[PDB]
Structure formats: C-alpha cells, structure tokens
C-alpha cells in the first residue's frame, strides 16, 4: 500500500479535527480512521512529508472537512464569536494536468455556502485584468449568483515552492496572508452575520475541468484548523 498520511506526527492535529469526503461530499473516512492509517491513491503520504490529494471528475473532491476534536460530529461557529478562527497551510501546487482549470485548496463554507474558496486558476480576467496559473480568493458578500455577490482577488501566481496561507477571521473580518503578507486586510464577512454553521474545509475541490479524467493534484506540507480566545 501508499505510505499513509498519519504515519508521521505533522498532520495529526488537523486529522483529529477532520473527515475526509472523497470522491464528493460523501464521507470517504472519520477523523479515526484518518489517523489510524486511511490512504490511497487520493490522499496519501507523498515524499515522505506531504499530504497529498489527488480528484478527476466536474466538481469532485479529495478534501477535509472542519469536525469537533477527539471524534466528535460536524463543526459549525460564526465569523463573529470575538474568538479568532485561524487556518495555516503550507502548500505545494503543482503545475496542474491539461483538462485541470480550478482546484479549490481551501475553504470557509457553511451550510448554504462558501464563504471563502482559495483556488488555483489556470488563467482568468479579474476587474479587467488578465491572470495566468495563480492563485485566487472568491469571497461571497451574498448568496446570489451576479458578480456583485462575489469578490475576487489575484493572492499571488503559483510557484514551484511551497506557498503558505493563512485565513484569519475575527469578529466579522477576513484576513489572507500568503507568504507572510497580508494580501486581504480586513474583508467583510458581515453578510453571515448570524450564520452559526461556518467550518473550515481544505485539500483538492475540481471545479469547471475541461476534461472528466484530468487529476487535480494539490500537496500540503502542513495544515492547522485553531480558535484562538
Ligand atoms: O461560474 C462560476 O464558476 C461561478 O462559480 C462560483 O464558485 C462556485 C464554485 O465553482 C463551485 O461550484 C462551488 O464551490 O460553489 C461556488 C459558489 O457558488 O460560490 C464563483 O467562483 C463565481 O464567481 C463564478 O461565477
Ligand atoms: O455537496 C454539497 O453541496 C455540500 O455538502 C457539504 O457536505 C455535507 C453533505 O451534506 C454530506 O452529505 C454530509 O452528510 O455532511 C456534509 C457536511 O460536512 O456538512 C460540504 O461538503 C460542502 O462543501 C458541499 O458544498
């Protein structure tokens, strides 16, 4: 068999606050079966030190989804608690197959919505301006599907090198950082003022390939969900 994920200390904490869903929403492992040696081809230890996920398929997924630590049920809290909500990655995104054209890496999504997807994007126009194999934000400001729903933002273009992020969210602001600077500073959340459901989510989401067979393939060399109060 693959090497798996948890036979190494680093993802552990993550696991213990995680289930798998794999190849869509469908859970595909608990958080003890994570950390009790869960692996394939789609998620798997992969260089001896990254988590590695792997999808082919129109909107299938290999991703974590936010759980109650030490084997408890789905997560749900709100971008207002006055605690900070934090996510750390450090990631390698690969150059991506042909057929392979957004692969959403992490998330904030709730039980109507994504809050926030943080996605690869092989080329794409942001407010008149055309972007190449980068990395962007797509925040939702409501749930409507007109552009003024949404705002989107160019993080950085895709390197060879891992890529760190993270999401900070605090009393209704969101915070991106990528390699230690503050890209968004102080996004407004505050449509999902009173939404009690938010969790964070993070691995390989495929969306809009031109190709149904195309993987997407998305490494992690580290991944944190923490509340920080
Ligand atoms: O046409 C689009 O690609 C449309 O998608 C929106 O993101 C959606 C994702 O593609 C997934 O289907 C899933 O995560 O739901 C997302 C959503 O409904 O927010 C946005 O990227 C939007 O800007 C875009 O028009
Ligand atoms: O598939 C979706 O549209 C969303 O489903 C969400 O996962 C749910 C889903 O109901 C599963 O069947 C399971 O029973 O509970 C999941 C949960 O963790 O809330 C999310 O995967 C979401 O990202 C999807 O958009």
């Given at each position: 068999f693959?090497?798996?994920?948890?036979?190494?200390?680093?993802?552990?904490?993550?696991l213990?606050?995680?289930?798998?869903?794999?190849?869509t929403?469908?859970?595909?492992?608990?958080?003890?079966?994570?950390?009790?040696?869960?692996?394939?081809?789609?998620?798997?230890?992969?260089?001896?030190?990254?988590?590695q996920?792997?999808?082919?398929?129109?909107?299938?997924?290999?991703?974590?989804?936010?759980?109650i630590?030490?084997?408890?049920?789905?997560?749900?809290?709100?971008?207002?608690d006055?605690?900070?909500?934090?996510?750390?990655?450090?990631?390698?995104?690969?150059?991506?197959?042909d057929?392979?054209?957004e692969?959403?890496?992490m998330?904030?999504?709730?039980?109507?919505?994504?809050?926030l997807?943080?996605?690869?994007?092989?080329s794409?126009s942001?407010?008149?301006?055309?972007?190449?194999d980068?990395?962007?934000?797509?925040?939702?400001?409501?749930?409507?599907?007109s552009?003024?729903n949404?705002?989107?933002?160019?993080?950085?273009?895709?390197?060879?090198?891992?890529?760190?992020?993270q999401?900070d969210?605090?009393?209704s602001?969101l915070?991106?950082?990528?390699?230690?600077?503050?890209?968004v500073?102080?996004?407004?959340?505050?449509?999902?003022?009173?939404?009690?459901?938010?969790?964070?989510?993070?691995?390989?989401?495929?969306?809009?390939?031109?190709?149904?067979?195309?993987?997407?393939?998305?490494?992690?060399?580290?991944?944190?969900?923490?509340?920080?109060?």
């Amino acid at each position: 068999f693959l090497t798996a994920v948890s036979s190494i200390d680093t993802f552990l904490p993550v696991l213990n606050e995680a289930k798998l869903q794999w190849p869509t929403s469908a859970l595909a492992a608990s958080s003890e079966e994570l950390l009790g040696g869960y692996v394939g081809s789609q998620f798997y230890l992969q260089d001896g030190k990254y988590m590695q996920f792997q999808i082919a398929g129109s909107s299938n997924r290999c991703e974590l989804r936010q759980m109650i630590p030490d084997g408890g049920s789905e997560i749900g809290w709100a971008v207002d608690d006055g605690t900070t909500h934090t996510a750390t990655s450090s990631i390698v995104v690969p150059e991506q197959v042909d057929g392979v054209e957004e692969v959403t890496i992490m998330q904030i999504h709730s039980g109507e919505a994504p809050q926030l997807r943080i996605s690869w994007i092989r080329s794409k126009s942001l407010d008149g301006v055309a972007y190449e194999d980068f990395i962007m934000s797509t925040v939702r400001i409501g749930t409507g599907d007109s552009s003024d729903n949404f705002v989107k933002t160019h993080l950085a273009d895709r390197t060879a090198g891992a890529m760190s992020f993270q999401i900070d969210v605090k009393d209704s602001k969101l915070t991106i950082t990528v390699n230690g600077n503050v890209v968004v500073n102080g996004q407004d959340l505050s449509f999902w003022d009173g939404t009690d459901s938010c969790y964070f989510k993070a691995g390989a989401f495929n969306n809009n390939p031109t190709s149904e067979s195309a993987t997407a393939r998305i490494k992690f060399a580290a991944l944190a969900w923490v509340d920080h109060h």
